[PDB]
Symmetry: D2
């Protein structure tokens, strides 16, 4: 069977509670997290975190997305930081147990509309193959359309994460989210534009609306601020990280902590440690019930398969949901239901593998084998690749149950199958 | 379309509370889904003619009950032959053929402590004549079920045992009886004489709730449409009783004197069909599905895991049906236990499984008669297509509908593990 | 366990095994059903009123005394049959049987008198026979009118006009008997005092298999509105000739109570049947079992969630009193009322505690039988010089009568609902009292 | 539209979060008490007057620092600042005095703690924040050191290590309340686990109906900066959303450059966070988990809170001798302010430990007839309520009183229309 020890770990006694109050009362500091950390860490790359050797330590510590702030530096400076990130990432390609995709995100300087510097920085992003744009001071839907147009003929696959930094962006949130790939709660400017005591309301509202929409949301700025000069964070800082994860954030971010601080690697390690504890403390029973109740009926087979797979994973405490995805969409639709099971996304697209770090609980595996002539064999090889990588990484063991999500024919947009396998 | 959301009590289905769900029930909201609660009709002088049996099958009879408290082995053998003749008269059109189970209802222990010698002989008769189900009278403890199982011998291992709870001891030892039984019958006739009449509804509701929690079939029986033995229309209490048995969660409803000896056997079957269909649409699935999931324990069985995923998927897209391939009926039973609003169309080659799955609410059995294709994946597809073609002919499905298809990874029973979202073309 | 552990130690495990209390503590409706126990005996007084139709089999004073002791709370006179002279004699016999118990005020049981109209027939509105029967009702001091075939709001206005200026106090319960009445339900309920789900005609006017939907919908809407709802016709039909009912009949009575009906009715079962007293006894027995089986945890939660916010102090006091009664497993809620309204507002929240309504109005004492769980006590003493002392005497009358009738025991907690000044409409106080 | 009422009406917690509005202004009085540590930066009578106006409800004296003479002078300055507002009885704000012990250090009750606890009794302190409580016998030792004269002093056990967290239930059982002392807890257990201990202890205290304080580094950067970090405002808001009855300032008020601004910031955040509480789920869960009871004060409290929610009552006015009737109302977390009218100056100060309890110290002449005396204490609550902005003409209030004088007899709830 599973054993009594299994049910004492990852806050499983608190998970079985009948009320949110009882769930809190059952949280246990001795109940150790077992699942892989699912909230991605975005680290801003700057003077303190630029070297290839330092970047290798940040990747090992848990950095999933490298942020380049175009409010500072230059094209030449950021291109060198990007090259160093890619060199550090590819230094682990020799071993399957250490290689991890790392997304590259460009954060714009900001604005009467799209600034000349933003047009040129967005063009630099397309030319350097960036995965994501964190668009500063998005105030309305037309600001997103301008960023989308500036991404030109080659950059339509780049994700646009609109940064909400002022009163107008909060008030026009629904129209901005509708046309964006996701949102960043940019608390630095938000805390100066609106009263500081109201930022938590904007953060919780935007995270809840993004969770309802199934779109990624980033919590940002001053999460571990004191760690710019101190080796350990304050009590308010660790609670801020934990509460951003409990709020429903897909990603958490470090700015000055990694760009200029004295402890960049330790700041990444601290966010990794807290996120893992907070993810186990999520009250999935109410969260899943409310996400299902609020999500409308759907005739899209990817959406229908995703909810069935997440329900199946909860039923058997599945060690993972393995999904085949080319664009990342099938993995994103699983992630929106917040399964406790890790979502292992097997893809041939290097860009999709980097971009899916935006979605909580998605573990990308880039697959490079040549295509099989028999499509069903190519699918089976990718599914077994997900299982063998899962075994190698500690996600899975023989005897475990996994949920497998595929489609009936090749090409993006046909996901319609959920299977229960049993690991051999 | 807007019309879709006005039918089958869908406005009441979207309510946030059970009280508001009741307030939104609409007598003009017509039922669309096929009737999912099976009807058991007791065979007798009123329902023994082969031609009358054909009318009862068309009216909705799913299970024919043989009451061994009346008549000899020669009488029951003739009843079996007549039922089979009426059932097989429709086998020439495989897309519309309806299997009908045959249940043997034992005489019982009488004044004895356990299995009577007449019951031993009747049970052996049942095995020799290939009955599908045994309704075991006056089950008081787990050893009564073991005795019935032993009397069926090695040749009757596939026969379902439905324990009839008819007295105080059976109600008190319910948990141990349900554990070893395939299902239960709330036998209200004797129960209403053995315990105070005003307490029977508590025993009925409790046993139906516990069977629903266990995922095992439960039958509500006796005097449901009693006045229809002599009158063409039932009383207001009788229609209410049928509707409330379905709302309680009964998998099956039964007719005794109404079909065995009365003057309106076909009309009694038609009345139970009409009421059950209305009551099934009035079920508050939002609370029911939530509570069945919450109470059901975690499972490592792939059939169980696939079943809950398929039911969740069916609710998400308002699937017209869940088509499942099954050898023993188990994969269909595990879908049924989650009470989907979507019809569970079970395709099987086992004639016995097709008859027995009528015990599970919402399971529509289709008996597949074609010999196996050389390529197993093609044989599976042909059976799924047979489910689709039968569903289109019977009115379950139309082009454009979404259906959930439940299959397994290898031949043989026990390997269901796949759920697939399919658009009907 | 922790939510009931201290009270289980104080009241004992036997207390928590009775009146379906294990099923009452369940966290889901499914678990509540699984925990229903035929060995869990009902303890509370029967709260769903029984309406018995008075006719040839139940007319004599001696027979009526047996029916009052068996549990009849409302006597129905069907003006579709008999005559003015016949029904006046039945009414006099009912009053004689009722007043035979008036010698002991601390046990006297009021019985309401209801007139059921013949109806409009093939006409579009109020018939001439109904005008005469309604005038008879006012002249004979009837408490309630069961108005046949109500199809729209103007039908109830016509009944109200026919009762004249002297019948303003008479309750109008509109009978819903056809498709139009069901479709125009909301406008009818708005102007009526309550509703009767008259299933006999309803089962002929709409498909028989749809009556349960109309019954459950109308009971739910009346529960939401806080207005009385009666379930009627063929509930124990076979008992017209047999001494025991069918399994569908007991189920029907139990399910009408579980649906939320305030009253249940007997027609031919008491008017002409061989076993009128046994039919009343059977409805009494089933209703007590079914009331205990109600899942109060979900019901109370849903009644609060659906009921809008209120600035009426009687309404605010009523929900606070019902919440307080549930918190301590109160034996009873004693309320002082002039019109019955404060008791009706307590009843709408469906407390498990009996609502003992102390009133000086003989008519209000009879009419409150329409509201589930209201036990009327007619106070006959002249007013004390100091109003606060008069209030206290009335509360003590409720306590002493409660102890004498078996509702209250020493050590019990009772909730007492009173107002801040004399006259109807000023209830605003809730008190927790320990019985000594 | 105000006080996050659109988010309050939501059918799910997720929809409640989606409906939170930065333009929906808080209207209710700030419910979560602020504990400020008094030290070099906040000692003067003039500075203490500004801290009282900014919202300080409890003055903490940390006996790990200073001396008996130093802390006695701080206490005298607190009392002088508090009494400077006594000339207007309808607006006077009581302020509690809390002694935080040095602790056991090496190893039961230290000899320094015995002397400091004696000092506390002699100086009439209201509360003891007992450091490093790891078992029930630590609480008994503190209680014994307070002697027969300190029977009325509240003991709030500070949970600062692994043992205190593991033996939480036995500690809470014998304590008046708890302090989640995150400074030591954050080095005694892994820093990334403190939030689990905080949320668990707050939840268990809420279930028990006993006060819980969130403490340490809440607005840390404000020791040198005029504005806090984004993590610090979030931390204050989340402690209130977690269910904390009190929030605390240590170095921020004891030695920092912006003590008054730190108090103002905690006041501003707490008020916003209290309106963002999802009362629909919270009341339902507290009401479901609170055990059945035959105690009339407990029965009246749930009836009164239910009644207040039904009519959107502006306040629940309660008469209390010890603070207990107000504490039992507070445990159900009403949105309505609990205005507690008491003659006990000590109970008025101590009741700041319970969220949403606004103490009014009654100093009007006694009425000859007890029923009239009760009525004038109720009218005093109404007049103070109107002057402070809690109540207006036309509002509905719930009034909670007892049937006889003396503590322990609360059994009446009344619905009253203002003016
Ligand atoms: O708004 C602010 O002032 C805070 C910005 N927070 S940050 O995005 O993490 C940030 C980014 C950067 C730096 C920071 O110290 C810093 O803190 C640099 O010194 C720097 C120097 C030269 C080239 C590039 C960088 C650079 O990219
Ligand atoms: O027709 C219907 O659907 C209603 C019948 N159900 S009843 O209202 O209870 C009912 C009422 C009555 C009778 C009934 O047999 C009867 O059954 C009488 O014989 C009778 C005889 C003489 C005077 C008066 C009555 C009299 O009032
Ligand atoms: O970090 C800790 O270990 C706790 C310190 N946080 S505190 O309790 O608020 C605190 C308290 C005090 C001081 C602080 O600077 C301080 O910060 C003093 O300078 C001081 C000087 C002279 C007499 C008394 C005090 C005095 O009481
Ligand atoms: O998430 P996406 O981008 O829609 O991709 C999902 C697709 O992946 C598959 O599972 C496998 O497709 P490929 O063989 O083309 O990679 C498809 O059946 C399904 O449509
Ligand atoms: O419900 P059961 O009895 O377990 O049968 C389900 C079985 O039916 C199938 O779908 C088809 O099997 P067969 O081809 O042997 O009929 C299997 O893959 C699966 O194991
Ligand atoms: O339920 P009703 O009709 O409003 O009557 C309640 C009234 O009864 C009382 O309790 C007593 O009033 P009386 O003294 O006039 O009988 C009033 O204080 C209260 O307003
Ligand atoms: O909250 P506590 O300490 O029990 O005090 C409540 C007490 O206060 C009162 O309302 C007023 O009593 P006093 O007149 O003695 O102040 C009592 O009736 C009640 O018992
Ligand atoms: O731009 C940002 O990241 C901010 O303002 O927090
Ligand atoms: O045997 C039966 O069916 C009964 O007693 O109801
Ligand atoms: O009128 C009635 O009572 C009926 O039709 O049921
Ligand atoms: O003593 C304290 O307050 C601490 O350690 O946080
Ligand atoms: K920027
Ligand atoms: K039999
Ligand atoms: K009539
Ligand atoms: K200290
Ligand atoms: Mg910014
Ligand atoms: Mg029998
Ligand atoms: Mg009629
Ligand atoms: Mg400490």
């Amino acid at each position: 069977e599973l054993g009594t020890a299994f049910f004492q770990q990852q806050q499983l006694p608190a998970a079985m509670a009948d009320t949110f109050l009882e769930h809190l009362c059952l949280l246990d500091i001795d109940s150790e997290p077992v699942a892989a950390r699912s909230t991605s860490i975005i680290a801003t790359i700057g003077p303190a975190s630029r070297s290839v050797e330092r970047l290798k330590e940040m990747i090992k510590a848990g950095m999933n997305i490298a942020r380049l702030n175009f409010s500072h530096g230059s094209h030449e400076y950021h291109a060198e930081s990007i090259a160093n990130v890619r060199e550090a990432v590819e230094s682990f390609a020799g071993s399957p147990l250490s290689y991890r995709p790392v997304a590259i995100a460009l954060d714009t300087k900001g604005p009467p509309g799209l600034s000349e510097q933003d047009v040129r920085d967005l063009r630099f992003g397309v030319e350097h193959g960036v995965d994501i744009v964190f668009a500063s001071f998005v105030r309305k839907a037309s600001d997103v359309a301008a960023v989308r147009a500036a991404l030109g003929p080659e950059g339509h696959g780049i994700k646009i994460i609109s940064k909400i930094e002022n009163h107008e962006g909060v008030k026009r949130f629904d129209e901005i989210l509708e046309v964006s790939d996701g949102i960043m709660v940019a608390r630095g400017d938000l805390g100066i534009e609106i009263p500081a005591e109201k930022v938590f309301l904007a953060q919780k509202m935007m995270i809840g609306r993004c969770n309802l929409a199934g779109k990624p949301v980033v919590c940002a700025t001053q999460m571990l601020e004191s760690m710019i000069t101190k080796p350990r964070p304050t009590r308010a800082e660790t609670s801020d990280v934990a509460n951003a994860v409990l709020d429903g954030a897909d990603c958490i971010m470090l700015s000055g902590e990694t760009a200029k601080g004295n402890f960049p690697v330790e700041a990444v390690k601290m966010q990794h440690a807290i996120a893992r504890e907070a993810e186990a403390a999520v009250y999935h029973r109410q969260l899943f019930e409310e996400l299902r109740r609020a999500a409308p009926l759907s005739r899209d087979p990817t959406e229908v398969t995703a909810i069935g797979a997440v329900e199946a994973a909860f039923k058997c405490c599945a060690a993972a949901i393995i999904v085949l995805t080319t664009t990342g969409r099938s993995a994103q639709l699983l992630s929106r239901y917040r399964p406790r099971a890790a979502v292992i996304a097997v893809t041939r697209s290097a860009q999709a593998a980097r971009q899916v770090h935006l979605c909580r609980g998605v573990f990308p595996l880039l697959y490079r084998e040549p295509p099989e002539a028999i499509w069903a064999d190519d699918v089976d090889r990718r599914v077994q690749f997900g299982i063998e990588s899962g075994k190698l990484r500690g996600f899975l063991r023989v005897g475990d149950l996994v949920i497998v999500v595929t489609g009936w024919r090749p090409g993006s947009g046909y996901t319609n199958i959920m299977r229960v396998l049993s690991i051999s």
